[PDB]
């Protein structure tokens, strides 16, 4: 569906949210790409309109999982992403090979989008993998200990804009609460 | 409850009351009329700028 | 300037348990947490999975069907992977029966398809377990939810009167339930930041209080709300206490919890309630609620929490021993 | 820290300056009266669109606008936040070094007269605050010509 | 509130500095420099921390309106295009709207 | 008549009026069916299960008329469900889904999306509907293994003198063959009181000691027991006489026996008492035990048979002080 | 090393041997599966159902060969199963029944009675096969809900002078938020005692009171507390000497912490002990209870923090002996 114990961050908190957001942009373009290609042919021909439209949902869902999988520290539970990133590499690559087999080239946009997709997807599997090098949740013997921030230990830290996710770092949802509670209760030095 | 609410009063009327009273009437509407026209003239610049472009 | 209380007046006691090593949790906790959900929230929880149970495996068949060539337009050349499966819409129907054992009949599986033979097995055993956990979830939820209601009412403010000569702290606990609380043991505990005479500093040392029942045991028979006459004496820690130190700024915390078991279910329950120094009105007496009617005994529960003053000596409990010695 | 703030700021306006450019494209597709779409290519029975045409669609340019607009604003807004954070800390270090130097200063009459308390007060009040603003407005110095 | 809170917090830090200037020799004479330096951090914490939150809300209110303002572009932009796509809206209205 | 704190059969009747609480939550309704009797439970779900066979079925016929399948003749479009002819027949189509039989004479095809929602609409409903049934049957069966209690006490109360000091007695005897584990049966006397400092108690609750061997609440019941109650100086009835037993009195002795039945594994309680008139001063309980050649038999039928035995007509104080003066 | 009666974690390794022949009833197998690991539980019934899907399916492929249907071609002979052609279809035929799919492509006719025998033969089995597993997962529902160990126990013991009185103590706190209803702790010392009449107790079990205010083994924990057992003249520890703190010392203490688990409704026992090596004479625990504006604060790091305090290194009997002189 205290909190200081629920604020540890996995490795690459930036390299993922940057990459994951980078995926939302180019993929959203493909959502236009299938729409444009379907204009001429009378039949809808969703075969280029459905996947990205479905895929765009997935990254949105996947990102929410990472925020949830990090807010509650269950580093073993970071296998679904491992089992989803890995599989997507198989399917995405196949399209590149078959398109390259038909001498599609880069003159067409779709092959250009797919080629970009492989690189972006490739980063996701590797970036996720680097976590296993650090936390070593499964397929490892000794889980190296991880500690929450020493400043975060004290309950006397509130303007925790630094202590928030990269997607949070800019959205200022960190200050959302202190803005929210101010509507009724006066704000004092406490 | 009330203490925050009593503090949380922007007081536009009182601010308008003293400021306008100092202003008077002649220069008062003159400020209102002149400012509105210039912004209106600015907007009208675009429509012609659109028209000749069209 | 509110002071922290070890137990809330409503019993929602909160203690900041920091500097805590992260205990390992397993996914079964979520499965346990699944049982812990609410009936409306759980209703969607299984339904969303049950819906995805129909769809997700079904999509495999639609992919599977396209492989054997049946997904193409009509052609009697090949033997279909599944009979009369045409579109991904029809894909749901073949699965919809399978997970639900419906067996509509027209969409029939056949032979000569190894992958399909795995489809009718893998999606099959999955459904049986899928319904099993949901059936198991309801099995535990139905019995347990009956004991999620608290129907015992303590007294918000405490009174300090004198009964049978001695002054004894009083509190009235009223039962809002028709069902009886078997094995009613209510233990009274006092908490203070008493630095030990040996020198040690105890920030929250807890001291129990004898209930002064008819047999000295914590056991009590609950029919109508009565007064737990906690006698204060030399053995009692409250001997040196006085209403002088009854201000909101005194490190004196009183805790009472009434252990028992719901008669209908047998599920043991506890009632957490606490009182501080400020909330207690010294020299107040309880207003009787039990009324003598010809037909039954009437409970004036609306008058349970009414504090009415009565002539009460204001001498110190330690000092009050002088009156007996002098006389 | 400051360099990253400017680096964000530089790409903030650089991405931002395309804002007007999209308007130039948006009108042109509207500017073509026929506006009839035909990709003129089908490699394997499914038409594939060329790059030069994908960036010519009026609706498509609009979608790129909202995506760019939100992206351009969010990075631009942070650029102020990063700098003002670095400057705010710099107030503490300057003040501490000011106070730390104060405690070890000599109390000569010239050191007390020629260095009056108000001058000591003014520096801690006027100077560091001014230096705070100078850092608070430093990137614009390194950015305003770029956008210009 | 915050600006009032910040401005109120601005007075002591300068004031404590003035007292140090006014009583320099004695403060060193008692050799209590350890205590006073704690106060300087104590004061500097108030002004600095208040400033960050003061800067924080200023950035937020800009962002929340800006993105809310941003949608006002696309919503109008799509609307104008559809009018120009089917309703035969002239470029003149199209150009002005984005402007 | 006279107000009794607890009835002889139990189920103490107390008018707990002046009630300010939430009227009802849906949890009560689920509790209400779960606590109903077997014949009532059988019909209620039967009505519920029958309702599913009807309520959803109403949707199909309306779904059918919309597609125009019900009209006679070969239709130009394949219907929402194959071989649906009339609302009477549609009940057969509905019965196949919720009950999961799926004969096949009725058939559902594609190209009818509104039906697709309907199939899902009743699919989850029936499974949930069936789920309540499995839950409901599970609940009623578990507790009903201990739906009754058969541990009785003598109708009248008996007082006599045992081991020099007089005492008030009672009779303990149970019927169910299975034993009750950890019997801690505490008895209490309730009477009107006004405190020496003036506080008035309409009926104070003070327990009496069962005077077992270990002086504790524990009891092991395998034979008809007579749990005595020693009358001591601190005893509430230490100023009691065989005279004040008239119907007009303030005494009220109630005993509640805690514990769980071994087979049940669930705690059960039994409230029994006896008023002032019910007692018979100077009467000893009839020995109901008798060990035969092979086994021992309990003559329970004479449990309440009170046999008068000579006793001193002096109060505990009026006896102890007389004994002390003796 | 030395033999242990209970490990620190709570394993309590005891080498119980010389045991007579146990029953080893086959019904215990289901209990083993009932307690089986969830992954193992996942596989166990799955293979059984997979075997069940095949075991009856094994019989059918023979049945078809018997009734003269598996042969190529359509003759006058009605098959034992409609449209039964080969093992692949046959292996589907069972899958229809034991899971009640009811595909319909394989239909049933009254050609051969053994088919009616076969249909019933597995018909009961499946309703039983699911019955065994459905109860199995039902058992694992509450069993997983247990999650026994959710508290803490002191790694080492402390012996400080409380209220001027010498007394040992320990510490414990609850890591989980859920409460422990009806706390009960018993402290006992397992030491090799001897009797005056020669009985050399191997490891005599002698308990020590918890010195609670009410003088009972009942407690209440919401915070990390220290149970202080007053070491007085009426306890065997009155002959203790700090010189006996070696791992080779012939003494030990055992603590049992019962209590009703509020959420689970099943009591969990805490098995712990401390060796003489863990005894830190003249050490005092640093308090971890702290106050905050929201509520009280607890420093779980400070559970094992020890602050040494001046302690008279004499015997409690001798210290009390000089206490009268002092």
Swiss-Prot record, chain A:
Superkingdom field: Eukaryota
Subcellular location: Cell membrane
Membrane topology, Extracellular segments: 32-48, 96-111
UniProt topological domain (Cytoplasmic) ranges: 66-78
Transmembrane segments: 15-31, 49-65, 79-95, 112-128
Oligomeric and partner information: Forms an heterooctamer with KCNJ11; four ABCC8/SUR1 molecules interact with one KCNJ11 homotetramer.
Cited function: Regulator subunit of pancreatic ATP-sensitive potassium channel (KATP), playing a major role in the regulation of insulin release. In pancreatic cells, it forms KATP channels with KCNJ11; KCNJ11 forms the channel pore while ABCC8 is required for activation and regulation.
Family as reported in the entry's similarity comment: Belongs to the ABC transporter superfamily. ABCC family. Conjugate transporter (TC 3.A.1.208) subfamily.
Record protein name field: ATP-binding cassette sub-family C member 8
Protein's organism: Cricetus cricetus (Black-bellied hamster)
Entire protein: shown range: 51 to 248 of 1582
From Swiss-Prot, chain C:
Places the protein is found: Membrane
Post-translational modification (record): Phosphorylation by MAPK1 results in changes in channel gating that destabilize the closed states and reduce the ATP sensitivity.
Membrane topology note: Multi-pass membrane protein
Record's catalysed reaction(s): K(+)(in) = K(+)(out)
Annotated site residue numbers, Role in the control of polyamine-mediated channel gating and in the blocking by intracellular magnesium: 131
Motif Selectivity filter: chain residues: 101-106
Effect of residue 23 to R: Results in reduced sensitivity to channel inhibition by ATP and increased channel activity
Main localization, broad class: membrane
A molecular-function term among this protein's GO annotations: ATP binding
Transmembrane residue ranges: 38-60, 114-138
Keywords: ATP-binding, Disulfide bond, Ion channel, Ion transport, Membrane, Metal-binding, Nucleotide-binding, Phosphoprotein, Potassium, Potassium transport, Transmembrane, Transmembrane helix, Transport, Voltage-gated channel
Sequence positions that bind K(+) 2: 104
Keyword Oxidoreductase: no
One GO BP: ventricular cardiac muscle tissue development
Positions contributing to a 1,2-diacyl-sn-glycero-3-phospho-(1D-myo-inositol-4,5-bisphosphate) binding: 147
Function field: Inward rectifier potassium channel that forms the pore of ATP-sensitive potassium channels (KATP), regulating potassium permeability as a function of cytoplasmic ATP and ADP concentrations in many different cells. Inward rectifier potassium channels are characterized by a greater tendency to allow potassium to flow into the cell rather than out of it. Their voltage dependence is regulated by the concentration of extracellular potassium; as external potassium is raised, the voltage range of the channel opening shifts to more positive voltages.
Family: Belongs to the inward rectifier-type potassium channel (TC 1.A.2.1) family. KCNJ11 subfamily.
Comment text on domains: There are two PtdIns(4,5)P2 binding sites: A canonical site where the phosphate groups of one PtdIns(4,5)P2 molecule are coordinated at least by residues Lys-38, Trp-39 and Arg-147; a non-canonical site where the second PtdIns(4,5)P2 molecule is coordinated by both KCNJ11 and ABCC8/SUR1 residues.
Description of how the protein assembles with itself and partners: Homotetramer; the homotetramer binds four ATP molecules (one ATP per subunit). Forms an heterooctamer with ABCC8/SUR1; one KCNJ11 homotetramer interacts with four ABCC8/SUR1 molecules. Interacts with ABCC9/SUR2.
Record-given protein name: ATP-sensitive inward rectifier potassium channel 11
Species of the source: Rattus norvegicus (Rat)
Parent-record interval covered: 30 to 356 of 390
